[PDB]
Write a protein that binds this DNA or RNA. Structure first.
Ligand SMILES: [K+]
Ligand SMILES: [K+]
Ligand SMILES: [K+]
Ligand SMILES: [K+]
Ligand SMILES: [K+]
Ligand SMILES: [K+]
Ligand SMILES: [K+]
Ligand SMILES: [K+]
Ligand SMILES: [K+]
Ligand SMILES: [K+]
Ligand SMILES: [K+]
Ligand SMILES: [K+]
Ligand SMILES: [K+]
Ligand SMILES: [K+]
Ligand SMILES: [K+]
Ligand SMILES: [K+]
Ligand SMILES: [K+]
Ligand SMILES: [K+]
Ligand SMILES: [K+]
Ligand SMILES: [K+]
Ligand SMILES: [Mg+2]
Ligand SMILES: [Mg+2]
Ligand SMILES: [Mg+2]
Ligand SMILES: [Mg+2]
Ligand SMILES: [Mg+2]
Ligand SMILES: [Mg+2]
Ligand SMILES: [Mg+2]
Ligand SMILES: [Mg+2]
Ligand SMILES: [Mg+2]
Ligand SMILES: [Mg+2]
Ligand SMILES: [Mg+2]
Ligand SMILES: [Mg+2]
Ligand SMILES: [Mg+2]
Ligand SMILES: [Mg+2]
Ligand SMILES: [Mg+2]
Ligand SMILES: [Mg+2]
Ligand SMILES: [Mg+2]
Ligand SMILES: [Mg+2]
Ligand SMILES: [Mg+2]
Ligand SMILES: [Mg+2]
Ligand SMILES: [Mg+2]
Ligand SMILES: [Mg+2]
Ligand SMILES: [Mg+2]
Ligand SMILES: [Mg+2]
Ligand SMILES: [Mg+2]
Ligand SMILES: [Mg+2]
Ligand SMILES: [Mg+2]
Ligand SMILES: [Mg+2]
Ligand SMILES: [Mg+2]
Ligand SMILES: [Mg+2]
Ligand SMILES: [Mg+2]
Ligand SMILES: [Mg+2]
Ligand SMILES: [Mg+2]
Ligand SMILES: [Mg+2]
Ligand SMILES: [Mg+2]
Ligand SMILES: [Mg+2]
Ligand SMILES: [Mg+2]
Ligand SMILES: [Mg+2]
Ligand SMILES: [Mg+2]
Ligand SMILES: [Mg+2]
Lengths: 77, 41, 45, 6
RNA sequence: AUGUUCUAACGUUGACCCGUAAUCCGGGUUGCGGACAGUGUCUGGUGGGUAGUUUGACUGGGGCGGUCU
RNA sequence: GUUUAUUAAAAACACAGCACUGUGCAAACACGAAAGUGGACGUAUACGGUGUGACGCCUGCCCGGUGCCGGAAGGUUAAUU
RNA sequence: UUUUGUAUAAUGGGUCAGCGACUUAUAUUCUGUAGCAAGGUUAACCGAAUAGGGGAGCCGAAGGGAAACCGAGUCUUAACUGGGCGUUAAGUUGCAGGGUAUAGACCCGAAACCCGGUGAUCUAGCCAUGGGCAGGUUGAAGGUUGGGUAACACUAACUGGAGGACCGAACCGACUAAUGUUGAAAAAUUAGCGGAUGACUUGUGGCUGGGGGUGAAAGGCCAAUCAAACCGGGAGAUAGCU
RNA sequence: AGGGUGACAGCCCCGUACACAAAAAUGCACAUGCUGUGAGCUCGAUGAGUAGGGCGGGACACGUGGUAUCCUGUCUGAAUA
RNA sequence: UAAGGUGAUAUGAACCGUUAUAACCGGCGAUUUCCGAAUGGGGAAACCCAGUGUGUUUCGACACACUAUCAUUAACUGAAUCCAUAGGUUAAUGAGGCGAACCGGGGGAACUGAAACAUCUAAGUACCCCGAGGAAAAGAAAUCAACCGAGAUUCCCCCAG
């Protein structure tokens, strides 16, 4: 599913609103990208499906912290 | 992305000096190759 | 004239039988509804 | 690729 | 801001190797593309493809014409 | 040949043939929130769409309108700033 | 019953029996009635307590002004001779009733719209795997042996057995007529009719699902239902109509 | 209370008021072991891709309105007593 | 607990019992086919077909137990690839399915009303989905208040149509 592995960002619903305020249901998808992260500890690339926001979280926290969080949730890589 | 260099990278700086790079440059090249570290401490 | 019901026990069981009902969540909901109503015959089986 | 054999 | 080159993101419905008794899939190697493509959010256009609807009243039947303060 | 099972079998539909048009292959196109799958285990002598409808003789004039195709100097013009 | 008007040849009722339509809750106003009265009354709750407690509130005893604000006045205006609204009229809480409001709101009745399911045992198309086509015709290409040519061409006989070919049963269909039309049958029977080696037909099984399928295209078909199936639900939709 | 009994029963029967009952299992409330569990004091420390922002939506009685506040798909991004 | 009793239609038969193993009632046990989550594989539910290990036999056979999946942990093993990792096997533990309402969450109509209709309404309703518990959720102020103060959450009556 379209779920960010780091943040848990997923499709959320909302409305398109026209100029005449017609509400039609829509979705807002996360900006997801499969990205190979270098993990120097494991000496390995780990592919994560990550939102762009999740990539900034990895930049800030470091991949090892984030992967440790994924292991505690039981979310797989 | 503020990084700290672990070698002399070309058109960046020598060992030890800390440079602001584009995050993609750090993420996808400098850090995997062992040319920079994220400015952590 | 050929009428609508042309019996085949194989097709009957494959279409509407117990295992066909159990195969999907909607089929299991049929069985749940029929049990709740107290049907003597849950399926064509 | 594919049910024919691939 | 554009042009060129590069490789490391990214693509690969090229090849090979392994998981493997599997062609799916994943990993690895290598080639080719390569910051393009593609996707997210936003945004202009297009959009009976689809949807919800509107499309007045008077009237010697209705319509047409005329009328409406 | 096909068709309105049950008031219409036809001059309607289809048809071989013809033409226009799209499509370079991860094809266009279609079914799919997607992955995929059909197209095709095909590859422009192929495939899709459209119209015409064996064959014969033929198929004139108009590009102003509406589309489509190409152009893009200039005018106008979104988010953004 | 409906109407200007019905013996009306307008509507409804075969008859009987049973059932079948102005309700309920809450709010609000008016009337009646009862209590208390410039007051009236409590809600939740506490209480085994229809008691008792609980006065949080609510309504009323003051209005005027958009408002600040002023106040038996006030607003208007720079200011009223004035002028508007007020002051010189008892309320409140039960109980019963009339009306109103929100609710299905007197009962029954749409065509429809939406949501989730069930259906390709009928039929449409396709897929896989099996089966069917009596009997009789016509005589394509090709072949061979002669002829003919420089070689081909071309030509005769013999052979050959093509075809959405021909005639015609099974089989598939459905052009005409009659019958039947509370049928023998919710589409048939009888006599004729078309196709009948094919774009044929048929058995078994499979796949496609409802704004969806499938369609040699008739809006055809998708279980006797189709310009949007069926079942259940939103649901007592709504009904200025009968 | 109520029911039954050949019609309507305090006194016919079964009950009812009331008073009693558990070998065994088990709910609960306590008392008390065992095994984890750590109270208390001083010293601190004080939740960052977060708050906030831009864009799009949604939620708040509050329909973008002069619109605070909350949530966040997207792009950003503090101060931290 | 007992002088009766072997459930019903429902008699009858053949019995059982009367001072306590008749029957009846309650506690705890035993047995508890097959299908069904269904779990050894399959399947048109109530059927078809196995593997493995033990034990037994009259060599024809018989009996018994185990063998699903996923998650977690452990052990052992083990690619490309050298370490390693992926992968593999085995063990233990747990899960799975069902259930009327209530509850939290993910999605989410339309009829209808507006005397038409699109904003708006209906309504975050119906419905679908996921998850839980005996309740759930919420909850211990980056809350209100108004210069006075209150002191988490929840629910009821007011405030107030
Ligand atoms: K590559
Ligand atoms: K790009
Ligand atoms: K359109
Ligand atoms: K007139
Ligand atoms: K007239
Ligand atoms: K015909
Ligand atoms: K033109
Ligand atoms: K009349
Ligand atoms: K009449
Ligand atoms: K009243
Ligand atoms: K009164
Ligand atoms: K006055
Ligand atoms: K009174
Ligand atoms: K109504
Ligand atoms: K009413
Ligand atoms: K439909
Ligand atoms: K009695
Ligand atoms: K933010
Ligand atoms: K509407
Ligand atoms: K209306
Ligand atoms: Mg339309
Ligand atoms: Mg509507
Ligand atoms: Mg209309
Ligand atoms: Mg008119
Ligand atoms: Mg014909
Ligand atoms: Mg017809
Ligand atoms: Mg006809
Ligand atoms: Mg393809
Ligand atoms: Mg034509
Ligand atoms: Mg012409
Ligand atoms: Mg009349
Ligand atoms: Mg008269
Ligand atoms: Mg008359
Ligand atoms: Mg009459
Ligand atoms: Mg008469
Ligand atoms: Mg009438
Ligand atoms: Mg009548
Ligand atoms: Mg006043
Ligand atoms: Mg023929
Ligand atoms: Mg036909
Ligand atoms: Mg006939
Ligand atoms: Mg013929
Ligand atoms: Mg014939
Ligand atoms: Mg028509
Ligand atoms: Mg039909
Ligand atoms: Mg419709
Ligand atoms: Mg409704
Ligand atoms: Mg109705
Ligand atoms: Mg009597
Ligand atoms: Mg803090
Ligand atoms: Mg804030
Ligand atoms: Mg924010
Ligand atoms: Mg703001
Ligand atoms: Mg908003
Ligand atoms: Mg099984
Ligand atoms: Mg089994
Ligand atoms: Mg469970
Ligand atoms: Mg309306
Ligand atoms: Mg809780
Ligand atoms: Mg203070």
């Amino acid at each position: 599913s379209r779920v960010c592995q780091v943040t848990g960002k997923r499709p959320v619903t909302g409305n398109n609103r026209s100029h005449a305020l017609n509400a039609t249901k829509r979705r807002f998808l996360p900006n997801l990208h499969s990205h190979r992260f270098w993990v120097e500890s494991e000496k390995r690339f780990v592919t994560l499906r990550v939102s762009a926001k999740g990539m900034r979280v990895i930049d800030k926290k470091g991949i090892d912290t984030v992967l440790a969080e994924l292991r505690a949730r039981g979310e797989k890589y | 992305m503020q990084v700290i260099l672990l070698d002399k990278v070309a058109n960046l700086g020598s060992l030890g000096d800390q440079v602001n790079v584009k995050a993609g440059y750090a993420r996808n090249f400098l850090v995997p190759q062992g040319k920079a570290v994220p400015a952590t401490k | 004239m050929k009428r609508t019901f042309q019996p085949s026990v194989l097709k009957r069981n494959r279409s509407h039988g117990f295992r066909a009902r159990m195969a999907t969540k909607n089929g299991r909901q049929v069985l749940a509804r029929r049990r709740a109503k107290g049907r003597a015959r849950l399926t064509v089986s | 690729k594919a049910x024919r054999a691939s």
